[PDB]
Amino acid sequence: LKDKTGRFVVLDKNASNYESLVDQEMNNVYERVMKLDPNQVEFLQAFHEILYSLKPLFMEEPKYLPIIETLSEPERAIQFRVCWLDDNGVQRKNRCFRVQYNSALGPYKGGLRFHPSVNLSIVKFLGFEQIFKNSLTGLSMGGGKGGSDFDPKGKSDNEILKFCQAFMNELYRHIGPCTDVPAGDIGVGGREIGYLYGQYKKIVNSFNGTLTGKNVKWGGSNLRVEATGYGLVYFVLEVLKSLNIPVEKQTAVVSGSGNVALYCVQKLLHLNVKVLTLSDSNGYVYEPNGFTHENLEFLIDLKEEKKGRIKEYLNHSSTAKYFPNEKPWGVPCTLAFPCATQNDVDLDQAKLLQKNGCILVGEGANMPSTVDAINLFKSNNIIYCPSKAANAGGVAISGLEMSQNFQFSHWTRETVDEKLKEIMRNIFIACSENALKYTKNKYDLQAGANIAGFLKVAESYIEQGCF
Amino acid sequence: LKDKTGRFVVLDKNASNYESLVDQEMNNVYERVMKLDPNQVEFLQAFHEILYSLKPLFMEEPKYLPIIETLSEPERAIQFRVCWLDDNGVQRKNRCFRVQYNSALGPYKGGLRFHPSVNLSIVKFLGFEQIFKNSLTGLSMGGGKGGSDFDPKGKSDNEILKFCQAFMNELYRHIGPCTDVPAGDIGVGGREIGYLYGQYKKIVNSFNGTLTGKNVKWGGSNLRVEATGYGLVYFVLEVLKSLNIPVEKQTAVVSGSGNVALYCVQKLLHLNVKVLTLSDSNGYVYEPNGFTHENLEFLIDLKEEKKGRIKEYLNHSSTAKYFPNEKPWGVPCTLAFPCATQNDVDLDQAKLLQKNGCILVGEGANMPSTVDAINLFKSNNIIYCPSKAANAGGVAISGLEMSQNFQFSHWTRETVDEKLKEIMRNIFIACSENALKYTKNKYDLQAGANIAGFLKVAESYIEQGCF
Amino acid sequence: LKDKTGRFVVLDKNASNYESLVDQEMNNVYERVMKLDPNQVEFLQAFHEILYSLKPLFMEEPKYLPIIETLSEPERAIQFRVCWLDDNGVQRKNRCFRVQYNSALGPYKGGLRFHPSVNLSIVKFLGFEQIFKNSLTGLSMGGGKGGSDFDPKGKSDNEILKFCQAFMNELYRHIGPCTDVPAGDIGVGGREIGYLYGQYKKIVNSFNGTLTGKNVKWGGSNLRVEATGYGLVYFVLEVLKSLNIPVEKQTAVVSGSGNVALYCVQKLLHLNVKVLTLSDSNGYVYEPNGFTHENLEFLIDLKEEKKGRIKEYLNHSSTAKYFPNEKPWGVPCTLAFPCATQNDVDLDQAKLLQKNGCILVGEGANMPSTVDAINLFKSNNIIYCPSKAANAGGVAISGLEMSQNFQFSHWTRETVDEKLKEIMRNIFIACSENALKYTKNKYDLQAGANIAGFLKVAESYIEQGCF
Amino acid sequence: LKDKTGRFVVLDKNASNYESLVDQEMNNVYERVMKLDPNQVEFLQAFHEILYSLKPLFMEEPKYLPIIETLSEPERAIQFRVCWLDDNGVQRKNRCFRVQYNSALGPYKGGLRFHPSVNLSIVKFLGFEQIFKNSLTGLSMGGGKGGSDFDPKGKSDNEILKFCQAFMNELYRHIGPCTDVPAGDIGVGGREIGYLYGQYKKIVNSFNGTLTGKNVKWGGSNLRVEATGYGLVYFVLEVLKSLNIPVEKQTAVVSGSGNVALYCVQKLLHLNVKVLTLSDSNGYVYEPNGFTHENLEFLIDLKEEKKGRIKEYLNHSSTAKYFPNEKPWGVPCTLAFPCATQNDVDLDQAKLLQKNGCILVGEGANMPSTVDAINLFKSNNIIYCPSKAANAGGVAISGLEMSQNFQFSHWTRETVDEKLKEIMRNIFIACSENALKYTKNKYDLQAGANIAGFLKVAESYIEQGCF
């Protein structure tokens, strides 16, 4: 009837109709959550997603049923008003958030998002998954998220600043080095974090690592930009190594042109992998013979350094070719690296990839593969690497940024990279064993990432008592 | 094109189309507001409701359109999880809130409510109105509302303590003497305020007036239980005077058994007003000749004090009579005091009292009359007393308590009442003046209230700057 | 050799040479003071000035020489940079200050001044005098002055907001309800105090009386605009009484248009005193017969309220007359109220009023009379009312506001005035008593003021210990 | 007459009757201490113990006489009431402590003890010796201690929790990462510290190393459990190595069955030492041919993992034999490791050990050897290892836990162990030289531990001034 603590009700695993008890309870867990937040579509969907993914574990430790239902409720969610003067003198208003989700494993860690479509649900959605992503890095980090429906597009620097100072004029009172360390995300890059940190240090009068993603000149870490892109390739190399699949005999197709796709390709080239593409929301580019370090240098320190359109890539490669309004998925590969947007890969695209020889998918972006696409991948014996695990390197460097701020140190690029490789190996190791242990599959990384990331946060929550 | 401040956009009170723009831009303000909170039903209603009632004020001053739109958004809105052990030792969870709405006229003020029904929409609706209501008192009280979806019914006294301490372990960091002074409400009674004040003092190690509604032995104030009902009568007694209508010559049908009703009657009788009824969820009693001090006394000091039922009254008043599940609104009168529930009075009822000489409705509860009845009444020239005013006495004493804790003092029952009678008289003057000035009705108290409650707030906001 | 405390060195009031030592050691105290701040011209002047005026007090008590020397040094003096964006988007800079001078009788009290002329010397001079001036009020107010070399003239309302918020982002950490209560002054008006109070409340998240001079809707106090002028008359009206000179039988020439003058007149007329003049930078108007309530009214509610010029008065008083760039000091009188600028009255002017029956000078502004004129007046037995006293009403209401915010209360216009009239009467008693006791003049109010302002401070300091 | 600082009186070492001056002064030091706390038996005894132990040093640096008398007085001792609800709803009460003894070398470090017999004296007793133990680790740690007369035995988990949350509900305000870092002890194991940390993080809203002994999942260190047991063997290996006594030719007898005895034996086996026993408060177990890694695995992960009685050991070893109601001391050995309770080894037991060949005693527990037993050991040329030094490894890992929390790192088990070996070597080196230098004995570790541990704390106290 109850676990060792007595605070939690067991679901008698030796009853005659156990599985039905679990299923029906999982269902009541979802029904109550749904009722708490009926119209938070993005949130309810991510919860339902993890919830049922964990079923193998619930069958095992039913005590984790009451727990996940509770952890799905932010320890603290703060919504605040923020007013700022536009460059015309007109006073403006934006809705802001900062969901301090979980604090069992360490200070709340989660980025900030300034985007017209930001809202409670979506912030709660990124925050809930941020928990398990942070848990997987092995480091000491909780889970948070926040942002504003403030649209940076079309704004002067002076406006991004005033809004950044206004935002922190409220946010600071809820964050700190050992409380909640926000980071960047869509809308918040180095510039924003520079103004956010500036305002913070100005009000609180302290120079610390309350924000990650900072400039190497005042607290930042090396590899701050290559982290995600590298972690991704490291995670896939780790999967490839365990199956004994020669990495230098693989062909990769990558989408996106951000810092994730850019450095994924850079690490891919270093490992001697042939990269055939990169892409823009307008179209994708193709290099017949594969990409080059030089080519990647054009794309990088120009169509991100100047912010052009991947089309300009043609002014550098007479051998390249652009495809207006298309994704790279029709290009045969063994490795697919979705580093663009949400729902980048759909059903038909997973079919092309499937019939073209694709053997593994590395999620570079946030849930790039559609729900039907994942199913197609898993059903066709194609290794699926979960965002939570494969692109966790971006969060790892974050923790390493704090570690360097706490130690009042600044490690070399090589030291940080070595740690990023061992962290990514630890993540693959945790996802394999939990997957094998709970689904007997072993390469069902989606179940493994969720189980490992949840088990650590839950045991800890129980250990820390009622709160 | 802009106001003196050049921060808001003025509509141009001297353009041909003008009156249409005040109608469209208002429609526009409710648009964005609605798209922001698509499903906060109760919230959008109290907003739209105040929005349109204020058209008389926008007509003169259109600068107030951009403002109400900004003030509709809580300056801060904290949602938090709370876990407590129940009596069986099982760990429980509950969602909690504290919407700090506006702090222009003073610290955030507002009670907490623990009802299974509570949620953000409800809290915001109750919270938004708190602003203006607290504005009409004339004291320095900002607006705010709090609470949890926690249900006391069924809980032991020990459980309500465990929950209150758990509640405060999170809420203490967001409230304070000059920051947020929560109060009691539905679910939070003198006990719950005592248990919360207990945890607050234990953690923060400070004895002060962070909460109003405390026992008189440690911060409480005399007239705490009668302030609302008292002021309701004091407000009407003030409305009648300006009309030269002898208060001691009217008949009053009144609904309730809470403090609002139980003392509305106690003051009505003290002025020689004959009260024929008193209500309860199951029914309403009746006194042909009228209630006696001793009659009202048995009731008060016994049904509520012993928490029985209004029926039992028939064990004292062999003269009285019960009327199984019925609303007193039938019995004819001159002064009707709705003090039971929201929409206590519907339309048909508004028709009964209408055809029986009911000359003044004096709300004693939270929005007692339906959107219809208010129109019916207002359509037949029946004095309609706006909740924000008539029952403001509850908040009136709330700040008098603050004043007394702040002065490390404790006033006589007499002093408090004199200051109370005085406030309500000013509440009458503002509503009246304003009504006359903006709607030429002078007794369109529903408008006087909004226009006066919102003004002190809006000007102050403008004077305080962009925050 | 030493005082009761054995911490200071006593000169020996019974040594032959003694009177020389009090003259040398004083000369010595100004030496070190001067060598410390070699170029703070204004500062060294207010110090040397107070230093020597206090010789009557040292004569009896030489322990006070070491003390004044120590109190001449601010307990704390914060200087800070402030950067704000101007309307063109250009980033601007300004030096700022907050000299917390003495906290013996209470928290630090003193306005802020934003004038291109502001600097440490000026702030210290204004700040030093604030001490004693705030000492004579009898309230619990320590001394302090603040400000910036920032110039509002030419700035938009938006710019004054951006600067005020920037100002407070630094100043909030150094001020507070019971630490430092800044106020308005030249450059900081009800608007700037509103914009500063806005930022202070936004950052600290506390509604309180950290600043005096707030709007009445959120902390302000009645008689805020008249306190200074009022008390000036109330002080003189008090001086005359002790002399048995009928206030309603004198003629008064007065300079100004600020609140000090505009209401000095309003009270002078209310007591039936005939005021023939009112001044302005460009000139001074004249009423042969005297100003009328309606006359003074047009002026006040129109020239200052509409910020025009005293000339325009001739668009109401066809009886009056303007006197192009001239000081009213000519027109003969019995009571002259200098309330325009420093050194408003020179020597020659002090000769005109001298030969015309001017029997009492009553300073209404910051040091209005020249070192000469004071001597001239004092040399011809003309009652000289020390700025520190006559215009202390401004500070008087400053602390009444604090009292009111502290008591979460708001007094009537009547109450405040009665307490005001009362303070000024005590201010008269202290100065008088002291004057008589130390200089046998009883009407050497200039000395009475210093000796009484400094004493409450110095004794308190000694009683408080070595800090 | 006085040291270099002048704040301390010397005891002229060149006087004719110096030794008598010192003895008599040491005596006055004890007489005044005794009088301050007449009935704190445990405290007075530990003080007297160190005091006279240090005499060699006092003869040397008499300046340390006034100092030890002062350091014997807690910089701060806080006693607090703690109320909590038992599982029956009945409110309960317990007396709690937290003696923040010394802060010269770093943040107060000392465990918490929940035991029916806890009281000021005993807490002060553990705190006073904790100082010198911490000083010896070489790390930066002060000395503290605390606990409650709260009896954990017979309590539900839910009760240990409520009491743990109640305890911290007061304690938190006095502790912090850089102020006071409590740890575990009798009554407080991992479970308690888990609930103590949980409550702390909940109230203060910070994730830091305010408590050591945490779970490796949220801040803990590897070796957290093996530390004391290992440090002990390392310290003895270090002593053995310096005498050139082959460690793999020794025979050890161990008492206790806790984490100290368990891992002492584990390290002993690794070093190839023959272990013959372990024990329970009921009786001791004996392995004829010595213990095995496997055997130790039964005892360990079972009679500590399940918490049985060392008697059950027989269900695993057909070769073992239990001895009801006896201690291991009658078993011949060269090495004796008292890891049980206070006063474990008595006079007769030290005689058996003595006549049986014992050459060294390693104090695993707190003062296990009786006072007569130590004398017998020292008088018979038997190496006596002081609790303060030999079992200091348990405190060392503690400091390493903080170091890992500050660096936001998590070192491997091998890195922590290496540091534990060097720390234990540094301790032996400090105890040898100070012993040799002050008693010419060299292996009078009891004098050395006390001298070294005191010299560092005292020089520092002087360096830091009067407080």
PDB file of N, CA, C and O in Angstrom, chain C residues 278-299:
ATOM      1  N   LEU C 278       5.620  90.966  -5.410  1.00  0.00           N
ATOM      2  CA  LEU C 278       5.903  89.561  -5.725  1.00  0.00           C
ATOM      3  C   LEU C 278       6.914  89.631  -6.853  1.00  0.00           C
ATOM      4  O   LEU C 278       6.737  90.408  -7.790  1.00  0.00           O
ATOM      5  N   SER C 279       7.963  88.817  -6.778  1.00  0.00           N
ATOM      6  CA  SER C 279       9.023  88.878  -7.778  1.00  0.00           C
ATOM      7  C   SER C 279       9.207  87.716  -8.742  1.00  0.00           C
ATOM      8  O   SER C 279       8.556  86.670  -8.648  1.00  0.00           O
ATOM      9  N   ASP C 280      10.142  87.923  -9.664  1.00  0.00           N
ATOM     10  CA  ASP C 280      10.480  86.939 -10.678  1.00  0.00           C
ATOM     11  C   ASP C 280      11.803  87.374 -11.309  1.00  0.00           C
ATOM     12  O   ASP C 280      12.157  88.565 -11.280  1.00  0.00           O
ATOM     13  N   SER C 281      12.528  86.398 -11.860  1.00  0.00           N
ATOM     14  CA  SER C 281      13.831  86.613 -12.507  1.00  0.00           C
ATOM     15  C   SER C 281      13.884  87.854 -13.410  1.00  0.00           C
ATOM     16  O   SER C 281      14.913  88.536 -13.486  1.00  0.00           O
ATOM     17  N   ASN C 282      12.771  88.132 -14.087  1.00  0.00           N
ATOM     18  CA  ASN C 282      12.673  89.272 -14.987  1.00  0.00           C
ATOM     19  C   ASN C 282      12.231  90.551 -14.271  1.00  0.00           C
ATOM     20  O   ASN C 282      12.606  91.660 -14.672  1.00  0.00           O
ATOM     21  N   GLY C 283      11.442  90.410 -13.208  1.00  0.00           N
ATOM     22  CA  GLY C 283      10.999  91.592 -12.487  1.00  0.00           C
ATOM     23  C   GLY C 283      10.040  91.299 -11.352  1.00  0.00           C
ATOM     24  O   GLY C 283       9.761  90.133 -11.028  1.00  0.00           O
ATOM     25  N   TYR C 284       9.526  92.371 -10.751  1.00  0.00           N
ATOM     26  CA  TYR C 284       8.599  92.255  -9.635  1.00  0.00           C
ATOM     27  C   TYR C 284       7.374  93.149  -9.829  1.00  0.00           C
ATOM     28  O   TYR C 284       7.490  94.325 -10.215  1.00  0.00           O
ATOM     29  N   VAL C 285       6.200  92.587  -9.562  1.00  0.00           N
ATOM     30  CA  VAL C 285       4.955  93.326  -9.696  1.00  0.00           C
ATOM     31  C   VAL C 285       4.705  94.163  -8.438  1.00  0.00           C
ATOM     32  O   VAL C 285       5.444  94.061  -7.457  1.00  0.00           O
ATOM     33  N   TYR C 286       3.668  94.995  -8.467  1.00  0.00           N
ATOM     34  CA  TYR C 286       3.356  95.863  -7.331  1.00  0.00           C
ATOM     35  C   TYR C 286       1.855  96.164  -7.219  1.00  0.00           C
ATOM     36  O   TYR C 286       1.173  96.388  -8.232  1.00  0.00           O
ATOM     37  N   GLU C 287       1.347  96.147  -5.986  1.00  0.00           N
ATOM     38  CA  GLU C 287      -0.057  96.466  -5.707  1.00  0.00           C
ATOM     39  C   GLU C 287      -0.062  97.587  -4.675  1.00  0.00           C
ATOM     40  O   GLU C 287       0.225  97.375  -3.488  1.00  0.00           O
ATOM     41  N   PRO C 288      -0.371  98.808  -5.124  1.00  0.00           N
ATOM     42  CA  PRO C 288      -0.426 100.015  -4.291  1.00  0.00           C
ATOM     43  C   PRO C 288      -1.209  99.776  -3.015  1.00  0.00           C
ATOM     44  O   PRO C 288      -0.740 100.030  -1.906  1.00  0.00           O
ATOM     45  N   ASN C 289      -2.424  99.278  -3.207  1.00  0.00           N
ATOM     46  CA  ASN C 289      -3.348  98.993  -2.124  1.00  0.00           C
ATOM     47  C   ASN C 289      -3.044  97.622  -1.483  1.00  0.00           C
ATOM     48  O   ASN C 289      -3.197  97.430  -0.262  1.00  0.00           O
ATOM     49  N   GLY C 290      -2.597  96.679  -2.309  1.00  0.00           N
ATOM     50  CA  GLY C 290      -2.262  95.349  -1.819  1.00  0.00           C
ATOM     51  C   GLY C 290      -2.846  94.257  -2.699  1.00  0.00           C
ATOM     52  O   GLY C 290      -3.778  94.512  -3.477  1.00  0.00           O
ATOM     53  N   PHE C 291      -2.310  93.043  -2.601  1.00  0.00           N
ATOM     54  CA  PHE C 291      -2.847  91.956  -3.409  1.00  0.00           C
ATOM     55  C   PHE C 291      -4.161  91.474  -2.794  1.00  0.00           C
ATOM     56  O   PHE C 291      -4.374  91.570  -1.582  1.00  0.00           O
ATOM     57  N   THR C 292      -5.030  90.960  -3.654  1.00  0.00           N
ATOM     58  CA  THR C 292      -6.327  90.444  -3.253  1.00  0.00           C
ATOM     59  C   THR C 292      -6.220  88.935  -3.284  1.00  0.00           C
ATOM     60  O   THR C 292      -5.336  88.389  -3.961  1.00  0.00           O
ATOM     61  N   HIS C 293      -7.100  88.257  -2.549  1.00  0.00           N
ATOM     62  CA  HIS C 293      -7.073  86.805  -2.577  1.00  0.00           C
ATOM     63  C   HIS C 293      -7.136  86.453  -4.067  1.00  0.00           C
ATOM     64  O   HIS C 293      -6.278  85.721  -4.572  1.00  0.00           O
ATOM     65  N   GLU C 294      -8.124  87.020  -4.765  1.00  0.00           N
ATOM     66  CA  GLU C 294      -8.298  86.795  -6.209  1.00  0.00           C
ATOM     67  C   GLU C 294      -7.058  87.228  -7.012  1.00  0.00           C
ATOM     68  O   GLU C 294      -6.725  86.637  -8.048  1.00  0.00           O
ATOM     69  N   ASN C 295      -6.390  88.275  -6.545  1.00  0.00           N
ATOM     70  CA  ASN C 295      -5.179  88.736  -7.206  1.00  0.00           C
ATOM     71  C   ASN C 295      -4.114  87.656  -7.043  1.00  0.00           C
ATOM     72  O   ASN C 295      -3.624  87.081  -8.029  1.00  0.00           O
ATOM     73  N   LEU C 296      -3.763  87.382  -5.784  1.00  0.00           N
ATOM     74  CA  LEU C 296      -2.752  86.374  -5.476  1.00  0.00           C
ATOM     75  C   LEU C 296      -3.117  85.075  -6.195  1.00  0.00           C
ATOM     76  O   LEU C 296      -2.224  84.373  -6.696  1.00  0.00           O
ATOM     77  N   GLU C 297      -4.429  84.793  -6.253  1.00  0.00           N
ATOM     78  CA  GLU C 297      -4.980  83.605  -6.905  1.00  0.00           C
ATOM     79  C   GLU C 297      -4.639  83.526  -8.394  1.00  0.00           C
ATOM     80  O   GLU C 297      -4.137  82.493  -8.860  1.00  0.00           O
ATOM     81  N   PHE C 298      -4.926  84.592  -9.148  1.00  0.00           N
ATOM     82  CA  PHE C 298      -4.596  84.611 -10.582  1.00  0.00           C
ATOM     83  C   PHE C 298      -3.124  84.211 -10.677  1.00  0.00           C
ATOM     84  O   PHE C 298      -2.778  83.230 -11.339  1.00  0.00           O
ATOM     85  N   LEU C 299      -2.277  84.970  -9.978  1.00  0.00           N
ATOM     86  CA  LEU C 299      -0.837  84.717  -9.920  1.00  0.00           C
ATOM     87  C   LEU C 299      -0.561  83.238  -9.744  1.00  0.00           C
ATOM     88  O   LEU C 299      -0.245  82.535 -10.705  1.00  0.00           O
TER      89      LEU C 299
END
